[PDB]
Structure 1
């Protein structure tokens, strides 16, 4: 093994800024250190092979430098389509090895949230179970706190975050917020709203509903 460690680990540059990732190597590497870009959710892709060789397809704002032990990977200017996690690795000896990884979240400007409170699914509510989903969509930062309310009340322990990876068009996170109050209670009540405060959109906001049926 020849421990390979990148740096920094999870950084936060901007669009038009040059992101420069560097990865030292326990021992010697020579020209044997590639690079990969692993977009959110996919598989690694090869961005640079043998210290400073570019791949076909891969842009030109990407490039490698030097060789020896100190290595560095640089981005002319960063685009919202570069919200990946980049890896370095070497193939001189074996086993092969990779860096602990460098994430690269893109920084933009506040895009105040959008909610779309979806009442329950007629039939889910046939399980003795029933979940009221809440959704904001395309915002930034990721700092968003959803406040669930029943008939202007609550009982908590039902909420549950899950937000997406930064979009590579906008660079805006989005998170759902399922309230799964199960059956027999969706009935016992009638307004389950879904208030929602965020860093950029002052004075809280919500999409609710007094239900509207039986």
Structure 2
């Protein structure tokens, strides 16, 4: 199969900036008929991909001319002049020359802002949950930048992996930050056998983790 390698996975820009997204094919994608079927799409959440460029360099009708495509052989590039808000989302390349048709892994175009450490909050299980025999400890890691972040759970000082579920928001439309939720779910039986519960956030804003904890007492 033709492998399409799309870089970068994430592209932070400021409005008005120049954006460049590229796509490399593992082999040539010249169709038998002489055409190179390389397409670029933009996809917004809950929406179908919308065509921007076809046959490497041809702008699809109604697409503003700030979008342009070029490339040859195995290297292809989408360029966006003066990025606008309506340009933000995920970009995919697609080769249509040799079956099976194959897509690049995508590029998220998102907004740049100053780095921000997460605001970390930890919450014990509610009595309502305990009465039903469950015990979830919830950690919010809110309003941070850039988007990459790690969470580590410790129970009485010992790292815990099982029973952890994480969720991430998309970039905030107003302050350009990201947020994360992490939930450690235990049984009441196991929760009552330990004292210290700790969630640790590691983020580029520091080499030392932000640590929040509580004691069951």
Q: Deviations over 1:124-153 (max 9, x none)?
A: 334433221112023233453434345x64
1:173 to partner: Cα distance: 3.7
Counterparts in 2 of 1:6 and 1:200: CA distance versus 1, 3 Å: closer
- Secondary structure (helix, strand or coil) at the match of 1:125 reads helix
Q: TM-score, normalised by structure 1?
A: 0.68
After superposing the two structures, state which structure 1 stretch, 161-170 or 125-134, moved more. Answer: 161-170
Counterparts in 2 of 1:157 and 1:35: CA distance versus 1, 3 Å: closer
TM alignment of 1:12-161, pairs within 5 A: 12=11, 14-15=13-14, 16-22=17-23, 25-28=28-31, 30=35, 32-39=37-44, 43-50=48-55, 51-56=57-62, 58-65=63-70, 71-78=76-83, 82-90=88-96, 97-104=101-108, 106=110, 108-150=113-155, 153-154=157-158, 156-158=160-162, 160=164
1:40 to partner: Cα distance: 6.0
State the aligned residue count.
Answer: 207
Question: Matched residues in 1 for 2:13 and 2:212: separation?
Answer: 32
Question: Matched residues in 2 for 1:125 and 1:190: separation?
Answer: 15
Question: Matched residues in 2 for 1:39 and 1:140: separation?
Answer: 21
Contact 1:88 1:101 in 2 (8 A): no
Question: Matched residues in 2 for 1:70 and 1:199: separation?
Answer: 32
Contact 1:136 1:176 in 2 (8 A): yes
Contact 2:29 2:73 in 1 (8 A): no
Q: Deviations over 1:12-38 (max 9, x none)?
A: 463324214245642235375432123
Question: Matched residues in 1 for 2:180 and 2:189: separation?
Answer: 27
Contact 1:194 1:207 in 2 (8 A): yes
| RMSD after superposition | 4.0
Query: Which segments of 5 or more consecutive residues in structure 1 lack a partner in the other structure?
Result: none
Higher strand share: 2
Counterparts in 2 of 1:126 and 1:46: CA distance versus 1, 3 Å: farther
Q: TM-score, normalised by structure 2?
A: 0.67
Contact 2:29 2:95 in 1 (8 A): no
Higher helix share: 2
Contact 2:22 2:75 in 1 (8 A): no
